[PDB]
Design an enzyme around this catalytic site. Structure first.
Site, PDB file in Angstrom:
ATOM      1  N   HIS A  45       0.876  -1.326   0.043  1.00  0.00           N
ATOM      2  CA  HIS A  45      -0.043  -0.102  -0.131  1.00  0.00           C
ATOM      3  C   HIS A  45       1.078   1.147  -0.123  1.00  0.00           C
ATOM      4  O   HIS A  45       0.451   2.267  -0.347  1.00  0.00           O
ATOM      5  CB  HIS A  45      -1.029  -0.129   1.150  1.00  0.00           C
ATOM      6  CG  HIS A  45      -0.473   0.316   2.633  1.00  0.00           C
ATOM      7  ND1 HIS A  45      -0.181  -0.525   3.550  1.00  0.00           N
ATOM      8  CD2 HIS A  45      -0.245   1.597   2.942  1.00  0.00           C
ATOM      9  CE1 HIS A  45       0.282   0.320   4.457  1.00  0.00           C
ATOM     10  NE2 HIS A  45       0.404   1.438   4.329  1.00  0.00           N
ATOM     11  N   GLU A  59      19.893   6.126   7.514  1.00  0.00           N
ATOM     12  CA  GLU A  59      19.288   7.407   7.941  1.00  0.00           C
ATOM     13  C   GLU A  59      19.110   7.225   9.607  1.00  0.00           C
ATOM     14  O   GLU A  59      18.670   6.248  10.043  1.00  0.00           O
ATOM     15  CB  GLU A  59      17.882   7.563   7.266  1.00  0.00           C
ATOM     16  CG  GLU A  59      17.289   8.681   7.544  1.00  0.00           C
ATOM     17  CD  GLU A  59      18.020  10.110   7.493  1.00  0.00           C
ATOM     18  OE1 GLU A  59      17.662  11.056   6.732  1.00  0.00           O
ATOM     19  OE2 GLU A  59      18.990  10.044   7.981  1.00  0.00           O
ATOM     20  N   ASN A  61      18.349  10.734  11.285  1.00  0.00           N
ATOM     21  CA  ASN A  61      17.341  12.150  11.526  1.00  0.00           C
ATOM     22  C   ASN A  61      16.967  12.595  10.280  1.00  0.00           C
ATOM     23  O   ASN A  61      17.762  12.816   9.570  1.00  0.00           O
ATOM     24  CB  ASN A  61      18.287  13.258  12.186  1.00  0.00           C
ATOM     25  CG  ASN A  61      17.534  14.625  12.646  1.00  0.00           C
ATOM     26  OD1 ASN A  61      16.660  14.927  11.626  1.00  0.00           O
ATOM     27  ND2 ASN A  61      17.543  14.806  13.773  1.00  0.00           N
ATOM     28  N   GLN A  64      18.447  16.457   9.392  1.00  0.00           N
ATOM     29  CA  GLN A  64      19.627  16.771   9.571  1.00  0.00           C
ATOM     30  C   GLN A  64      20.652  15.912   8.995  1.00  0.00           C
ATOM     31  O   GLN A  64      20.554  14.883   8.912  1.00  0.00           O
ATOM     32  CB  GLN A  64      20.173  16.901  11.008  1.00  0.00           C
ATOM     33  CG  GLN A  64      19.275  17.950  11.800  1.00  0.00           C
ATOM     34  CD  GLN A  64      19.778  17.822  13.499  1.00  0.00           C
ATOM     35  OE1 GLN A  64      20.657  17.081  13.854  1.00  0.00           O
ATOM     36  NE2 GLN A  64      19.196  18.796  14.131  1.00  0.00           N
ATOM     37  N   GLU A  69      24.296   8.534   5.620  1.00  0.00           N
ATOM     38  CA  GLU A  69      23.092   8.060   4.588  1.00  0.00           C
ATOM     39  C   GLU A  69      23.797   7.902   3.075  1.00  0.00           C
ATOM     40  O   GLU A  69      24.659   8.341   2.690  1.00  0.00           O
ATOM     41  CB  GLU A  69      22.216   9.419   4.402  1.00  0.00           C
ATOM     42  CG  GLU A  69      21.639   9.963   5.626  1.00  0.00           C
ATOM     43  CD  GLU A  69      22.587  11.298   6.341  1.00  0.00           C
ATOM     44  OE1 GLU A  69      23.737  11.057   6.215  1.00  0.00           O
ATOM     45  OE2 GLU A  69      21.987  12.110   6.662  1.00  0.00           O
ATOM     46  N   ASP A  93      -0.193  -7.772   1.786  1.00  0.00           N
ATOM     47  CA  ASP A  93       0.335  -6.402   1.760  1.00  0.00           C
ATOM     48  C   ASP A  93       1.934  -6.267   1.673  1.00  0.00           C
ATOM     49  O   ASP A  93       2.575  -6.096   2.690  1.00  0.00           O
ATOM     50  CB  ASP A  93      -0.293  -5.400   2.798  1.00  0.00           C
ATOM     51  CG  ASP A  93      -0.080  -4.049   2.861  1.00  0.00           C
ATOM     52  OD1 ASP A  93      -0.336  -3.308   3.878  1.00  0.00           O
ATOM     53  OD2 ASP A  93       0.398  -3.735   1.764  1.00  0.00           O
ATOM     54  N   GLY A 186       2.960   6.882   8.454  1.00  0.00           N
ATOM     55  CA  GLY A 186       4.371   6.893   8.061  1.00  0.00           C
ATOM     56  C   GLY A 186       5.192   5.822   8.436  1.00  0.00           C
ATOM     57  O   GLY A 186       6.636   5.699   8.348  1.00  0.00           O
ATOM     58  N   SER A 188       4.299   2.419   7.983  1.00  0.00           N
ATOM     59  CA  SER A 188       3.813   1.274   7.195  1.00  0.00           C
ATOM     60  C   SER A 188       5.069   0.865   6.207  1.00  0.00           C
ATOM     61  O   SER A 188       5.816   1.729   5.964  1.00  0.00           O
ATOM     62  CB  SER A 188       2.827   1.873   6.165  1.00  0.00           C
ATOM     63  OG  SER A 188       1.557   2.335   7.038  1.00  0.00           O
ATOM     64  N   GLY A 189       5.151  -0.299   6.112  1.00  0.00           N
ATOM     65  CA  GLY A 189       6.208  -0.895   5.395  1.00  0.00           C
ATOM     66  C   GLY A 189       7.421  -1.161   6.401  1.00  0.00           C
ATOM     67  O   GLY A 189       8.193  -1.991   5.772  1.00  0.00           O
TER      68      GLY A 189
HETATM   69 NA    NA Z   1      19.549  12.715   7.898  1.00  0.00          NA
END
Ligand code: NA
Length: 240
Positions: A45, A59, A61, A64, A69, A93, A186, A188-189
């Site tokens: 979804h 990741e 933050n 910032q 990353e 799903d 946010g 989800s997944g």
């Molecule tokens: Na960051």
């Protein structure tokens, strides 16, 4: 994640942020788990919308520079063939994303370990949900990765009338439902990590919560049960 606490920056190295291009910028939309150097597992979804996506690994933050990353485009999206967008409760799903480049592994970026096929967690097993989702019902996304302790609720209980009833299927795992801690928009997944024989594995992909709010008593967060899809995952990756 509602009722969560900030995660240590090297606790959950298989966690990724799936983001979409919004004007001149990028915005976080959901979570997922790195399962090969060039494959990510997330919820179907999450990729229902026709957007441009990228994956961010290492990741911590969202707002910032962390100095860890790696940003990588999504090259192909394979959604489970039975998935039906207007019927999340039917299940299936789950989706795999092939990345444009393979990411480099380090202490912030590692492959998620999957459970063996068929594995089911006993009632009340210790699990953590992680993610950057809303920190309160109708709230805002977290800046820093959050984690919350959410003990599993077995199928016999979560499928009873005062919990989810027949909306929950054996292809799912439920966790939480204390009314304080839960998944939220946010998240989800993203993964549900459960400690089994001394080793965290990703047992769930966050799928849905109750329209009556994220942290609602007797409406535990519902996750796709990853151990139901081991052969599907292997097949997709072997054929792509
Ligand atoms: Na960051």
């Amino acid at each position: 994640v509602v009722g969560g606490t900030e995660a240590q920056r090297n606790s959950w190295p298989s966690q990724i942020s799936l983001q979409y291009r919004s004007g001149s910028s990028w915005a976080h939309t959901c979570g997922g788990t790195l399962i090969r150097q060039n494959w990510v597992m997330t919820a179907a979804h999450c990729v229902d919308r026709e957007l441009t996506f990228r994956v961010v690994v290492g990741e911590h933050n969202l707002n910032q520079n962390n100095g860890t990353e790696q940003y990588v485009g999504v090259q192909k999206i394979v959604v489970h063939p039975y998935w039906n967008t207007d019927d999340v409760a039917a299940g299936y799903d789950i989706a795999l994303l092939r990345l444009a480049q393979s990411v480099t592994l380090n202490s912030y970026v590692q492959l998620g370990v999957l459970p063996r096929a068929g594995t089911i967690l006993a009632n009340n097993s210790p699990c953590y949900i992680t993610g950057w989702g809303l920190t309160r019902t109708n709230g805002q996304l977290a800046q820093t990765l959050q984690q919350a302790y959410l003990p599993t609720v077995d199928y016999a209980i979560c499928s009873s009338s005062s919990y989810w009833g027949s909306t929950v299927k054996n292809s799912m795992v439920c966790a939480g439902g204390d009314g304080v801690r839960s998944g939220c928009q946010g998240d989800s997944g993203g993964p549900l990590h459960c400690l089994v024989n001394g080793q965290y594995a990703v047992h769930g992909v966050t799928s849905f919560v109750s329209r009556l709010g994220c942290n609602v008593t007797r409406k535990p967060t519902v996750f796709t049960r990853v151990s139901a899809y081991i052969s599907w995952i292997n097949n997709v990756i072997a054929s792509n």
